[PDB]
């Protein structure tokens, strides 16, 4: 159904990445000089500190200047709603492209179609395009991570001669908040070699990831950063988190960290360029 209150589809998990890229390129969008994916937790409430309020504004401005794609979850609750609102206002002020990926079952309401969606999860209508993953019904655990990771890897494998970047299209992952999903996505991205940028000085887990750049130090940092998250998590989950963090820190030559001292302007572009 084409949401209206751009476009919205329902693609099953077992979908061909090449088919999706052909769909998006043949008659929807052009080749992407750059592509940036942001990962955030499912928490509806996020800290809208001035630092995060300005860094992402600079990021979206850079994306418009380069005509880059932005990949987010696509839910009205959280930082992604802020990103969508900024996209809307910039468009009101050569168009930006934003894609949200989420599971159809995880959506609070489902309408079959040009259907209309009017305000269980709620999805933002600001994002131009959205994706629906059909893996189950009322499935609390994430079911779209695999599809997003495969799509990012395939787009990395793509070749574009027009781009100044040597050969393949550049891709950069952005980390802002904490949560198991954040670590899983970062580990998959780093394992895929796509550089990741973490905003130090803000965010629950970004701070510890910046601090690290064997088990005792990581455990101390994790407990210091998240007094409540660790308490609820069982011991096995904590061990799995430590394993993931060690995995990503092993390949530290890729990830880059924004520093608090360099609080001046033109820092987002500098960090992205350095990582690339």
């Amino acid at each position: 159904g084409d949401i209206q209150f751009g476009k919205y589809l329902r693609l099953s998990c077992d979908t061909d990445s090449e088919t999706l890229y052909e769909l998006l390129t043949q008659h929807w969008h052009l080749k992407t000089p750059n592509l940036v994916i942001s990962v955030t937790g499912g928490a509806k409430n996020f800290a809208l500190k001035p630092r995060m309020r300005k860094i992402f504004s600079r990021l979206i401005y850079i994306a418009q200047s380069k005509g880059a794609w932005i990949l987010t979850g696509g839910t009205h609750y959280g930082l992604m709603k802020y990103i969508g609102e900024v996209v809307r206002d910039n468009t009101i002020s050569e168009n930006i492209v934003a894609i949200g990926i989420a599971a159809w079952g995880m959506v609070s309401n489902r309408d079959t179609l040009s259907a209309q969606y009017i305000m269980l999860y709620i999805l933002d209508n600001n994002h131009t395009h959205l994706l629906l993953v059909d893996n189950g019904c009322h499935g609390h655990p994430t079911v779209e991570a695999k599809l997003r990771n495969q799509l990012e890897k395939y787009i990395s494998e793509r070749t574009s001669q027009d781009s100044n970047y040597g050969g393949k299209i550049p891709i950069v992952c952005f980390a802002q908040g904490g949560g198991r999903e954040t670590l899983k996505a970062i580990n998959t991205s780093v394992k895929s070699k796509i550089p990741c940028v973490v905003v130090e000085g803000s965010g629950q887990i970004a701070d510890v990831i910046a601090s690290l750049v064997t088990s005792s130090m990581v455990k101390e940092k994790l407990v210091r950063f998240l007094p409540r998250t660790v308490s609820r998590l069982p011991e096995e989950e904590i061990e799995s988190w430590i394993k993931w963090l060690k995995e990503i820190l092993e390949s530290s030559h890729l990830l880059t960290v924004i520093k608090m001292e360099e609080a001046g302007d033109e820092i987002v572009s500098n960090a992205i360029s350095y990582a690339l």
């Binding site: 329902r10 693609l11 099953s12 979908t15 999706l20 769909l23």
Partner: peptide, 10 residues
């Protein structure tokens, strides 16, 4: 057109 392409995709 678009509907047929979408159906063929999935």
């Amino acid at each position: 057109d678009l509907v047929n392409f979408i159906q063929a995709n999935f």
